[PDB]
From Swiss-Prot:
Subcellular localization, as worded in the UniProt entry: Cytoplasm, Perinuclear region; Golgi apparatus; Golgi apparatus, trans-Golgi network; Cytoplasmic vesicle, Autophagosome
Full-protein interval shown: 548 to 577 of 577
Summary of subunit composition and partner proteins: Self-associates. Interacts with HD. Interacts with GTF3A. Interacts with MYO6. Interacts (via UBAN) with ubiquitinated TFRC. Interacts with GTP-bound Rab8 (RAB8A and/or RAB8B). Interacts with TBC1D17. Interacts with TBK1. Interacts with TRAF3. Binds to linear ubiquitin chains. Interacts with LC3 family members MAP1LC3A, MAP1LC3B, GABARAP, GABARAPL1 and GABARAPL2; OPTN phosphorylation increases the association (at least with MAP1LC3B). Interacts with RAB12; the interaction may be indirect.
Source organism of this protein record: Homo sapiens (Human)
Upregulation: Up-regulated by TNF. Up-regulated by IFNG. TNF and IFNG act synergistically to stimulate OPTN expression. Induced by glucocorticoids, such as dexamethasone. In an in vitro experimental setting, in which donor eyes are subjected to increased perfusion pressure (10 to 30 mm Hg) in the anterior chamber, there is no up-regulation in the trabecular meshwork at the transcript level for periods ranging between 1 and 24 hours. However, exposure to continuous elevated pressure for several days shows an induction of OPTN expression, with a 56% increase after 7 days.
Chain sites annotated for binding Zn(2+): 9, 12, 25, 29
Disease cited in the entry: Glaucoma 1, open angle, E: A form of primary open angle glaucoma (POAG). POAG is characterized by a specific pattern of optic nerve and visual field defects. The angle of the anterior chamber of the eye is open, and usually the intraocular pressure is increased. However, glaucoma can occur at any intraocular pressure. The disease is generally asymptomatic until the late stages, by which time significant and irreversible optic nerve damage has already taken place.
Gene: OPTN
UniProt protein name: Optineurin
Task of the protein: Plays an important role in the maintenance of the Golgi complex, in membrane trafficking, in exocytosis, through its interaction with myosin VI and Rab8. Links myosin VI to the Golgi complex and plays an important role in Golgi ribbon formation. Plays a role in the activation of innate immune response during viral infection. Mechanistically, recruits TBK1 at the Golgi apparatus, promoting its trans-phosphorylation after RLR or TLR3 stimulation. In turn, activated TBK1 phosphorylates its downstream partner IRF3 to produce IFN-beta/IFNB1. Plays a neuroprotective role in the eye and optic nerve. (Microbial infection) May constitute a cellular target for various viruses, such as adenovirus E3 14.7 or Bluetongue virus, to inhibit innate immune response. During RNA virus infection, such as that of Sendai virus, negatively regulates the induction of IFNB1.
Tissue specificity remark: Present in aqueous humor of the eye (at protein level). Expressed in the trabecular meshwork (at protein level). Expressed in nonpigmented ciliary epithelium (at protein level). Expressed at high levels in skeletal muscle, also detected in heart, brain, pancreas, kidney, placenta and liver. Expressed in dermal fibroblasts (at protein level).
Length: 31
């Protein structure tokens, strides 16, 4: 029983399917 967690950017609220996509986003997101 393992769900499918999803990463979300708190700076804006972009839906990030994974950490890899989340990392690239936060790296190029408005600080
Ligand atoms: Zn963001």
């Amino acid at each position: 029983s393992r769900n499918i967690p999803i990463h979300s950017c708190p700076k804006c609220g972009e839906v990030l399917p994974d950490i890899d996509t989340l990392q690239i986003h936060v790296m190029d997101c408005i600080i």
